[PDB]
Amino acid sequence: IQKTPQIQVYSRHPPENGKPNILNCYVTQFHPPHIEIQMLKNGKKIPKVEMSDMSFSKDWSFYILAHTEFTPTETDTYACRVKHDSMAEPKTVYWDRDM
Amino acid sequence: NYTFRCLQMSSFANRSWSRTDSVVWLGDLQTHRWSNDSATISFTKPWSQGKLSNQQWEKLQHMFQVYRVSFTRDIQELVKMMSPKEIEIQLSAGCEMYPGNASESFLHVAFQGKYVVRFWGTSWQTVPGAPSWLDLPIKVLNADQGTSATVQMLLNDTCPLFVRGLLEAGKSDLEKQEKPVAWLSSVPSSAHGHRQLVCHVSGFYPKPVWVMWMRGDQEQQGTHRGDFLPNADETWYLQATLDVEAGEEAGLACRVKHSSLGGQDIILYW
Ligand SMILES: *[C@@H]1O[C@H](CO[C@@H]2O[C@@H](C)[C@@H](O)[C@@H](O)[C@@H]2O)[C@@H](O[C@@H]2O[C@H](CO)[C@@H](O[C@@H]3O[C@H](CO[C@H]4O[C@H](CO)[C@@H](O)[C@H](O)[C@@H]4O)[C@@H](O)[C@H](O[C@H]4O[C@H](CO)[C@@H](O)[C@H](O)[C@@H]4O)[C@@H]3O)[C@H](O)[C@H]2NC(C)=O)[C@H](O)[C@H]1NC(C)=O
Ligand SMILES: CCCCCCCCCCCCCCCCCCCCCCCCC(=O)O[C@H](COC(=O)CCCCCCCCCCC)COP(=O)([O-])OCC[N+](C)(C)C
Ligand SMILES: *[C@H]1O[C@H](CO[C@@H]2O[C@@H](C)[C@@H](O)[C@@H](O)[C@@H]2O)[C@@H](O)[C@H](O)[C@H]1NC(C)=O
Ligand SMILES: *[C@@H]1O[C@H](CO)[C@@H](O)[C@H](O)[C@H]1NC(C)=O
């Protein structure tokens, strides 16, 4: 069947303004294993995004880690948009430093 | 204990189109990758060859190179003559090491995300509840004894053998200790007046970790531990939320125990 992705977006280090960091987008629990993942800075797409090889858990569902380099600021908001057959509209999960 | 897994994932879209990409792991750390478009199996670690010689490795690699093309070709034919007429298939194979050079080997196949066949002892086996039409294929395949002897060598023999080699070869990587850095934050909850304190802990290795909201020495047992989330530099991310009455934040600390700290815990105060 079609299992839909769950998406998590978390920094590598404690985020601090003006300070280079890494932003992870862990996508999980989906099937089939065909997906486009985008990472966004202020709605615009980030071209430079590196990705783990797709793998799957004991429970057969696939998971993949995307990450990019980013300098968090007061104003720049970040997110992760996922394209996937199990879903009419793309999902978008906004980075939230406080969360 | 250590689980060694070879995960294969193959998609068939058409009869024109299909691809197989594998990745293998030794617990946390990936040892290999093998893309459909690469003719050979990449090493994601310096020790990904374990102890086997170039000879011995290449022997095993040739065997997989044959298996991959075969698997594809066989499955495509299985597609033609089948079901009424219906693809995503997955293999998880390997072994689990134990104190006394003991292990249980395994090989499971999932079709359309559902577990359907495993290899057990000497023959392939449709698992209970699987579609009837697999019975025949699984029998035909069981007529090819070469592949059953082959598969038995790989499970009973090669798996423990190789993995033992990996454990020695990779020792420093698997016994790495990487220290967690921790930070605090909070967000409002649904409940009015209530806030959610969060304890983010990132960069630790190995996985097992302990993160508790404390008030002095009273373990705050409302502490809810999230899922373990992977960083890309092969370390772990976890966070623990504690919901609280506004102002009830006062005098609270989150502490973290972890192998890598000796026994000198981290203790961010709020
Ligand atoms: C590789 O290891 C195999 C076992 O290991 C497991 O499976 C592998 C693939 C991994 O997953 C590993 O981690 C697992 O632990 C090993 O298979 C074993 O070998 C023998 C011979 O092939 C099998 O023995 C025969 O069993 C049947 C009855 O089986 C039933 O009952 C038993 C227990 O009571 C259960 O295990 C089964 O589920 C069945 O319900 C006997 O009737 C039969 O006796 C007859 O045949 C023999 C000929 O050998 C004669 O001597 C007798 O007189 C009888 O005529 C056998 O005793 C054993 O079942 C099988 N284990 C399993 C799991 O079924 C395989 O041989 C190894 N191969 C190599 C190349 O190293
Ligand atoms: C196994 C783990 C051991 C550890 C090894 C360490 C190194 C690993 C690093 C590299 C990772 C490899 C990635 C692959 C994943 C591992 C899976 C292990 C598979 C072992 C296969 C052995 C190959 C033998 C072989 O090539 O046989 C050949 C091809 O057969 C297959 O396709 C095997 C398919 C197995 C899957 C069954 C389908 C499951 C249910 C389907 C549901 C839809 C035999 O060809 P043949 O010549 O016998 O065909 C003619 C038939 N005949 C003789 C009757 C006339
Ligand atoms: C056959 O399918 C090809 C590949 O399809 C793509 O890959 C699959 C796994 C999905 O990700 C799917 O959404 C993609 O489109 C096509 O490019 C090809 O044109 C198709 N041709 C036929 C015979 O239908
Ligand atoms: C996978 O590899 C085979 C041969 O290496 C090739 O013909 C096939 O088209 C590849 N898969 C895709 C979708 O490129």
Side-chain angles (χ1 to χ4, degrees):
Chain A
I1 44 171
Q2 298 201 5
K3 268 147 194 179
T4 85
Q6 154 180 41
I7 295 169
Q8 324 221 19
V9 181
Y10 45 99
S11 58
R12 233 261 61 175
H13 304 288
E16 178 186 353
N17 291 321
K19 309 304 169 168
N21 209 318
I22 298 155
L23 192 48
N24 310 311
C25 179
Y26 188 44
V27 182
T28 237
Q29 282 299 330
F30 65 84
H31 181 293
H34 310 284
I35 213 171
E36 161 162 310
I37 296 163
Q38 317 178 301
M39 273 165 129
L40 313 172
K41 160 145 142 214
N42 305 149
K44 263 236 295 176
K45 189 170 176 294
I46 301 160
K48 71 203 181 162
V49 168
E50 198 61 77
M51 320 237 310
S52 71
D53 304 320
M54 193 160 295
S55 167
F56 54 89
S57 314
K58 154 105 204 332
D59 80 324
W60 301 105
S61 57
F62 297 87
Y63 60 93
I64 186 163
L65 184 63
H67 61 99
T68 191
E69 286 169 23
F70 86 127
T71 289
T73 317
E74 299 182 11
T75 59
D76 298 293
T77 85
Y78 289 86
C80 192
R81 187 161 290 169
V82 163
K83 271 160 180 184
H84 190 67
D85 292 303
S86 84
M87 282 180 69
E89 304 293 330
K91 222 212 269 266
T92 304
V93 184
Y94 286 72
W95 177 54
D96 188 346
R97 35 158 95 229
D98 320 64
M99 272 213 172
Chain B
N1 76 307
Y2 266 112
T3 289
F4 176 78
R5 291 195 298 166
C6 296
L7 319 188
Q8 172 190 322
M9 60 214 98
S10 309
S11 302
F12 302 80
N14 312 315
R15 17 286 157 79
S16 55
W17 198 96
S18 79
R19 85 200 233 76
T20 286
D21 302 307
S22 318
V23 303
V24 342
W25 305 84
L26 187 55
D28 282 324
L29 317 175
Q30 189 185 1
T31 66
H32 303 78
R33 157 207 310 110
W34 189 20
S35 287
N36 183 74
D37 50 38
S38 166
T40 66
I41 300 167
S42 277
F43 290 8
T44 58
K45 297 282 174 250
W47 42 267
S48 282
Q49 190 165 311
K51 282 291 226 251
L52 312 172
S53 71
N54 305 356
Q55 165 210 88
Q56 295 183 341
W57 174 254
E58 205 75 35
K59 211 76 236 68
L60 204 68
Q61 198 178 233
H62 190 275
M63 184 222 64
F64 282 125
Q65 270 150 355
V66 165
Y67 159 73
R68 185 168 61 176
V69 302
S70 265
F71 175 89
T72 290
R73 178 202 68 219
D74 295 13
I75 288 286
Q76 292 272 20
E77 277 198 55
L78 189 53
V79 173
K80 296 176 211 167
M81 227 275 76
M82 216 234 283
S83 309
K85 205 273 191 295
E86 213 166 312
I87 301 185
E88 289 295 336
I89 291 163
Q90 295 174 247
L91 268 82
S92 173
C95 45
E96 323 203 6
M97 310 302 93
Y98 293 122
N101 297 277
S103 42
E104 215 194 301
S105 277
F106 62 84
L107 156 41
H108 302 294
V109 183
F111 175 85
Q112 313 295 44
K114 205 186 209 87
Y115 171 46
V116 282
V117 175
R118 54 162 203 176
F119 185 92
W120 188 246
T122 52
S123 86
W124 296 97
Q125 291 188 354
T126 270
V127 303
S132 52
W133 54 266
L134 228 57
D135 291 319
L136 175 43
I138 292 290
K139 210 195 166 171
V140 325
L141 173 57
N142 268 336
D144 170 21
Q145 168 72 26
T147 287
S148 159
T150 287
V151 164
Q152 282 166 65
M153 284 143 39
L154 293 168
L155 293 173
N156 300 21
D157 256 68
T158 315
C159 201
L161 191 91
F162 185 56
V163 169
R164 282 193 233 93
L166 294 159
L167 289 164
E168 184 177 14
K171 195 187 164 62
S172 54
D173 265 338
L174 315 201
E175 305 181 353
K176 77 185 191 166
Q177 292 272 330
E178 287 266 322
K179 284 167 177 177
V181 174
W183 68 97
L184 300 193
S185 66
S186 61
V187 308
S189 57
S190 327
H192 201 26
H194 283 346
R195 290 192 72 73
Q196 207 191 35
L197 307 187
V198 185
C199 191
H200 317 262
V201 184
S202 186
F204 54 93
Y205 204 85
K207 210 189 190 219
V209 78
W210 188 97
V211 186
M212 199 86 66
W213 281 99
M214 309 291 286
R215 168 156 286 132
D217 284 13
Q218 286 308 314
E219 230 140 80
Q220 302 314 307
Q221 310 204 302
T223 296
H224 281 156
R225 188 205 61 193
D227 286 293
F228 293 89
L229 312 171
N231 295 317
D233 80 321
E234 299 184 310
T235 69
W236 282 111
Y237 176 106
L238 188 66
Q239 76 176 30
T241 47
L242 185 74
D243 178 58
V244 304
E245 314 257 340
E248 212 168 57
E249 298 126 35
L252 271 176
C254 155
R255 85 181 294 129
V256 178
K257 316 182 169 305
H258 180 265
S259 48
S260 73
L261 311 189
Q264 309 300 331
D265 297 0
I266 295 183
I267 334 187
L268 302 199
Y269 287 79
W270 184 264

